[PDB]
Amino acid sequence: HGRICMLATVGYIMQEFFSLPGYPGYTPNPIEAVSSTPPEALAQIVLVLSIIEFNSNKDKWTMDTMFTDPAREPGNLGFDPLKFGENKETRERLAMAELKNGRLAMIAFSGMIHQTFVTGKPLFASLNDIFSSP
Amino acid sequence: VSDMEGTGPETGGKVFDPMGLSKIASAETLAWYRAAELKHSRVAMAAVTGWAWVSSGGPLFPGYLSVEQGVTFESLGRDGYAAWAAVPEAGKFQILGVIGILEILSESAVKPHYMAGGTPGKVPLLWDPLGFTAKLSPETLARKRLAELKNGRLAMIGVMSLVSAHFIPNSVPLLPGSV
Amino acid sequence: ETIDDLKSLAVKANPVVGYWNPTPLADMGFWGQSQEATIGFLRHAELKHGRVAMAAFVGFCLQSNGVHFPWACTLEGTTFGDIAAAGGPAAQWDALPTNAKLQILLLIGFFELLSENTYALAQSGQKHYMRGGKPGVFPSLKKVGIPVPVPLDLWDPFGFTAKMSQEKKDAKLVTELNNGRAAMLGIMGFVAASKVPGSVPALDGLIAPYSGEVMAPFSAGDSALPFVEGMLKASP
Amino acid sequence: SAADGMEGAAHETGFTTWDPLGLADLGSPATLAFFRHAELKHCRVAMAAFTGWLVAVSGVHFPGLCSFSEGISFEDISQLTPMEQWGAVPALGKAQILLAIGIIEHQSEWKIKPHYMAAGGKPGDLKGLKSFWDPIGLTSKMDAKKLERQRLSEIKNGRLAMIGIVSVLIANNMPGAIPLPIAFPAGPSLVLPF
Amino acid sequence: DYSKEELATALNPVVGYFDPLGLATADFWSQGNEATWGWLRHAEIKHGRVAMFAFVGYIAQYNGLHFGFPLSLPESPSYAAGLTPPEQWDALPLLAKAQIFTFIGFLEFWSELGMETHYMKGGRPGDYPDFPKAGVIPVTPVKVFNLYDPFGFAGKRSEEQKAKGLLAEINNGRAAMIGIMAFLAEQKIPGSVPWGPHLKPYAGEVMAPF
Ligand SMILES: CCCCCC(=O)OC\C(C=C=C1C(C)(C)C[C@H](OC(C)=O)C[C@@]1(C)O)=C/C=C/C(C)=C/C=C/C=C(C)/C=C/C=C(\C)C(=O)C[C@@]12O[C@]1(C)C[C@@H](O)CC2(C)C
Ligand SMILES: CC(=O)O[C@H]1CC(C)(C)C(=C=C/C(C)=C/C=C/C(C)=C/C=C/C=C(C)/C=C/C=C(\C)C(=O)C[C@@]23O[C@]2(C)C[C@@H](O)CC3(C)C)[C@](C)(O)C1
Ligand SMILES: CC(=O)O[C@H]1CC(C)(C)C(=C=C/C(C)=C/C=C/C(C)=C/C=C/C=C(C)/C=C/C=C(\C)C(=O)C[C@@]23O[C@]2(C)C[C@@H](O)CC3(C)C)[C@](C)(O)C1
Ligand code: KC2
Ligand code: KC2
Numbered sequence A: 001h002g003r004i005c006m007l008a009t010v011g012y013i014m015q016e017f018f019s020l021p022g023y024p025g026y027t028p029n030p031i032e033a034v035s036s037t038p039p040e041a042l043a044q045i046v047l048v049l050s051i052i053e054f055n056s057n058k059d060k061w062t063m064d065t066m067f068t069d070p071a072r073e074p075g076n077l078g079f080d081p082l083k084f085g086e087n088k089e090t091r092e093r094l095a096m097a098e099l100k101n102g103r104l105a106m107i108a109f110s111g112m113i114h115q116t117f118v119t120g121k122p123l124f125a126s127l128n129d130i131f132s133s134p
Numbered sequence B: 001v002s003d004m005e006g007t008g009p010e011t012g013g014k015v016f017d018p019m020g021l022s023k024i025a026s027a028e029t030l031a032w033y034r035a036a037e038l039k040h041s042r043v044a045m046a047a048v049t050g051w052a053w054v055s056s057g058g059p060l061f062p063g064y065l066s067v068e069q070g071v072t073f074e075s076l077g078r079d080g081y082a083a084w085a086a087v088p089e090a091g092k093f094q095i096l097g098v099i100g101i102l103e104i105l106s107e108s109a110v111k112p113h114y115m116a117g118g119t120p121g122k123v124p125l126l127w128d129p130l131g132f133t134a135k136l137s138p139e140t141l142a143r144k145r146l147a148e149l150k151n152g153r154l155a156m157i158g159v160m161s162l163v164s165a166h167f168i169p170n171s172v173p174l175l176p177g178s179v
Numbered sequence C: 001e002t003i004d005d006l007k008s009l010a011v012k013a014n015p016v017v018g019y020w021n022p023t024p025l026a027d028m029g030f031w032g033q034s035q036e037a038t039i040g041f042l043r044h045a046e047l048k049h050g051r052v053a054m055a056a057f058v059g060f061c062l063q064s065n066g067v068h069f070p071w072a073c074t075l076e077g078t079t080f081g082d083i084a085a086a087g088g089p090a091a092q093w094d095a096l097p098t099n100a101k102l103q104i105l106l107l108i109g110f111f112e113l114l115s116e117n118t119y120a121l122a123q124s125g126q127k128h129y130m131r132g133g134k135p136g137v138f139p140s141l142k143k144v145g146i147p148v149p150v151p152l153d154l155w156d157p158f159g160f161t162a163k164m165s166q167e168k169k170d171a172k173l174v175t176e177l178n179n180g181r182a183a184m185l186g187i188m189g190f191v192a193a194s195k196v197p198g199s200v201p202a203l204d205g206l207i208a209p210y211s212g213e214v215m216a217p218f219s220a221g222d223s224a225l226p227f228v229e230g231m232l233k234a235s236p
Numbered sequence D: 001s002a003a004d005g006m007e008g009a010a011h012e013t014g015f016t017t018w019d020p021l022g023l024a025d026l027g028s029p030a031t032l033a034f035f036r037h038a039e040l041k042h043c044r045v046a047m048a049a050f051t052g053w054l055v056a057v058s059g060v061h062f063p064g065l066c067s068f069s070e071g072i073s074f075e076d077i078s079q080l081t082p083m084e085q086w087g088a089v090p091a092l093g094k095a096q097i098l099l100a101i102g103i104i105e106h107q108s109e110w111k112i113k114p115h116y117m118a119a120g121g122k123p124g125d126l127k128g129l130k131s132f133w134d135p136i137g138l139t140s141k142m143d144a145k146k147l148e149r150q151r152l153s154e155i156k157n158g159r160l161a162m163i164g165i166v167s168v169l170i171a172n173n174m175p176g177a178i179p180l181p182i183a184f185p186a187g188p189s190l191v192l193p194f
Numbered sequence E: 001d002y003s004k005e006e007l008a009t010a011l012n013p014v015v016g017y018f019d020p021l022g023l024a025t026a027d028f029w030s031q032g033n034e035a036t037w038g039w040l041r042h043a044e045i046k047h048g049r050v051a052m053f054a055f056v057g058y059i060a061q062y063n064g065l066h067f068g069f070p071l072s073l074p075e076s077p078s079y080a081a082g083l084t085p086p087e088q089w090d091a092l093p094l095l096a097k098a099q100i101f102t103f104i105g106f107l108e109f110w111s112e113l114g115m116e117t118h119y120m121k122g123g124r125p126g127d128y129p130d131f132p133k134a135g136v137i138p139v140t141p142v143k144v145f146n147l148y149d150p151f152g153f154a155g156k157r158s159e160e161q162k163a164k165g166l167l168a169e170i171n172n173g174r175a176a177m178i179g180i181m182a183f184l185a186e187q188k189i190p191g192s193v194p195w196g197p198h199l200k201p202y203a204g205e206v207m208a209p210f
């Protein structure tokens, strides 16, 4: 959840400002932009994430099934191309940092989502409206 | 303070600090004072030489300061404050930004910092590109450092004289009334 | 040549004044080269500056009076008399033809190339000046071995200083250095009188005025060559 | 830091490693080798990008037609702003340009068997792809000292070039970013492939 | 073969070895320095030979030196007057230029084929092979006279007198290359060779044969 939401917060803040050039159905408000955008885009995204989850958790989709092997660690899906984990001195720092930033990002994404629900405007537009003249 | 350069024969071969400002200064504070003194000397020497060359009817740069905005070096004014005001704001911005990048590079790139056990007011980044004082003897180099400090202090006095002559109508005796 | 050798030469040149060197140029390392290399470069530069000024002082003196050649340059017909009537010697120069200027300049470049060539200097019997060689040397244009021979060399065309003694020749190189310094000051005085009027008090009203840039070898008439019209317009 | 023996320490940062945030201390020597390889790739691509950007702005272009089917020519592509040229290129042309670049990348990862991340990697080294780097043997005349100097020059020029290409591509869209007032060419700062 | 500095000293003692690009120490196609040096030397010799040949041809044919043969039966299009030599080549019919290029292609093909191994692979640069014995080529019932010394005026000279000729060939070829490029630059760009001749203002890309 922390990884998903710390992708999601950056996506949320940067979708207000930047667009894919000529992408159909853009709206700075991502809530409205979900409906505005083509359904096939979101369908393909969900399909790709389903493939990723299935292949990464093959035969390990359940509490009893997963973590049967002792070497399996929580969150260690083997994703480390740059091999930061080979340096064991910084592994504790990076693990704690992942955990804390994921937690802050879950909270932050909830904040952005519900603030856009409240205001109807995108994140930094609402932030400016808060920090505007009386 | 008694071991630093800058003292000359013109003050009894002795230090000039009437108001005790060096007595409340540690090694780091004295290094900061020397760095500030030298940088002020450098800036004031360049400033006073430029002001004298411009306002003394000296040669000006050939063409257009801004070919698009339409400002010739001759039309700038040949008067210090007026010329600086007439310089485009973009030109002033990029001059100050280049100087700021140089200052940050100076602070971050001269190791043993002048406030952590380094020579005060030396810039290996900007000095003698070609060859000039990379082969001089350690006594003539000290003599020329003393000369630098002396005529730099004189340049401080001169540039603030020009500023006072500009603002106060006729404050300097032997300077014009339209500085 | 060490600074001791420079001092000895200065003493031989001017016994009263002696070695004057307020500049650091003899102390710096030019292009990251050594002390000997720097001193050789400065000494050869002094000698060449001298020699060129000595030659050009006589040229200015003779052409300003008018001793122009009786023959004619370009076949269509603009005699050396017409180039002389163009004005004073700088006016005569910048009124010369483009190809005449280029031929003079590129022959001088050829001579400079042969002067700095290792083979020609070695054949004449001396090394390059920045690499432990006698400054002021110009090699023979005979021993270099052009495919078609050359009758006479540049220095010693007919061997007037042939034989002699090397002590004598060094004593006359002292004369060369002093005369070259004086000639450089003299020609710069002439050209200053030509451009800035009243700049040389003795020669005020005696040297013809001039407006072109003496440091511009080509003129507006030579704008056909690339990047010259704009440079004439961009002259300071 | 781990980036001490690595070449790249310059004259403008003293002669010490410039790692204010300590990323070189993060991760493994394999991670630092990846960082060095990415630095040199961004360097090289930025030099190429700035040269191509200057070519596009100058308008110098190849003589001929990009595609005889669509009829688009180098001149018609040159009429647009530098970033719009990529949009103007034919789709199959972009596809095969990216195919060539991908093949080069794949061979760089594959045929250079002592890998940059692996031990004895030589992260900047892409020679080994025979006749890819320096086909004319221009670097053969040099020695180790001049080769090290030229590698440092590569690194400096490339860092400056990536700053420069970012600057020119962001100047017009973000006015007042680069202070020099000149008509930087219009168009997006970022473009998608195809 | 000849070492680079030795060859340069023999060619011009004043210049000696000169290679700012460092192509003598290059590795073209990853074939090795010896092979690539042989390639460079043979390329220099070929360029020089072609330049001498083309320079004598240029001076000959620019003064309207048309062969006595009528050539084309309707009309020799390039023998017409008011024609710079590049325009004569352009005015030649396409079949003529095509046949010329196939002939030069046969010559180049046989030059590459007949070698000790190759000029790259430890062979003398610039050595055109003896044409084959007799009948070992399609047709060729009699023989093909060698492109070098068809009448065999090559045993006349001695080994050192051939080395001298080789060095003179290289230097003359460099001069001829510069001369032809001077001629063409003067034709296309007037006054580019101010100290050279004044040729007609021919305006056509010489690098387009057809
Ligand atoms: C400034 C540049 C200078 C360098 C270039 C240069 O000088 O260009 C000069 C140039 C053009 C020109 C210019 C000018 C207008 C004339 C002058 C101007 O000059 C200035 C301004 O300065 C400009 C310039 C240079 O452009 C052109 C040069 C052309 C050249 C050099 C042409 C050689 C053909 C030889 C042939 C066909 C021999 C066949 C020989 C054969 C077939 C043999 O029998 C070989 C032989 O071995 C055999 C088999 C057996 C042995 O027993 C010995 C012999 C020998 C018998
Ligand atoms: C302005 C004011 O108020 O005051 C002044 C200041 C001001 C402006 C500076 C003035 C000036 C101009 C000055 C002073 C100009 C100075 C000019 C100077 C001093 C010019 C020397 C040339 C020597 C040459 C060409 C010799 C060649 C000699 C050679 C190559 C030889 O043949 C000699 C030879 O012996 C050798 C070497 C070998 C022997 O085997 C024999 C031979 C014969 C072959 C004025 C006019 O005074 C006014
Ligand atoms: C201050 C302000 O406001 O604005 C300023 C700053 C700001 C904004 C950043 C600006 C910008 C953009 C900038 C500065 C852009 C910089 C771009 C840069 C620095 C681009 C390098 C390319 C290098 C290449 C392609 C080299 C290839 C070289 C190759 C492939 C070689 O073969 C090299 C070679 O050595 C070998 C390997 C072997 C030798 O045998 C032969 C040679 C020598 C040939 C402005 C607006 O312009 C100006
Ligand atoms: C020391 C400081 C300094 C540096 C290091 C520096 C470097 C560069 C570089 C290379 C890195 C480039 C490529 C470049 C380009 C331009 N500079 Mg700049 N420049 C400096 C100072 C000034 C000043 C004072 C002015 C100025 C200007 C312009 C104009 C505008 C032309 C026009 O609009 O006609 C252009 C194109 C003028 C201006 O913006 O006037 C509105 C102006 O007054 N620059 N400048
Ligand atoms: C990485 C660089 C690169 C390589 C190595 C490479 C190699 C080959 C080979 C040999 C292996 C062949 C046989 C071949 C043939 C064609 N190439 Mg191609 N090509 C490259 C780049 C581009 C670009 C940029 C374009 C392009 C095109 C065409 C068209 C036109 C078709 C048309 O009429 O539409 C044809 C026939 C254009 C295009 O695809 O246009 C839609 C176009 O813009 N190519 N190309």
Ligand SMILES: CC1=C(C#C/C(C)=C/C=C/C(C)=C/C=C/C=C(C)/C=C/C=C(C)/C=C/[C@@]23O[C@]2(C)C[C@@H](O)CC3(C)C)C(C)(C)C[C@H](O)C1
Pocket (backbone or CB within 6 Å): A099, A100, A101, A103, A104, A105, A107, A118
């Ligand atoms: C502990 C920890 C960490 C942490 C943390 C942090 C910073 C956590 C932060 C949590 C945070 C900031 C949680 C906010 C909740 C807000 C809510 C529920 C608001 C509801 C708001 C509601 C229901 C509003 C309703 C109304 O508007 C409506 C709809 C209409 C109006 O008429 C009436 C009102 C106004 C009432 C690290 C450092 C990240 C890692 C470490 O390892 C572990």
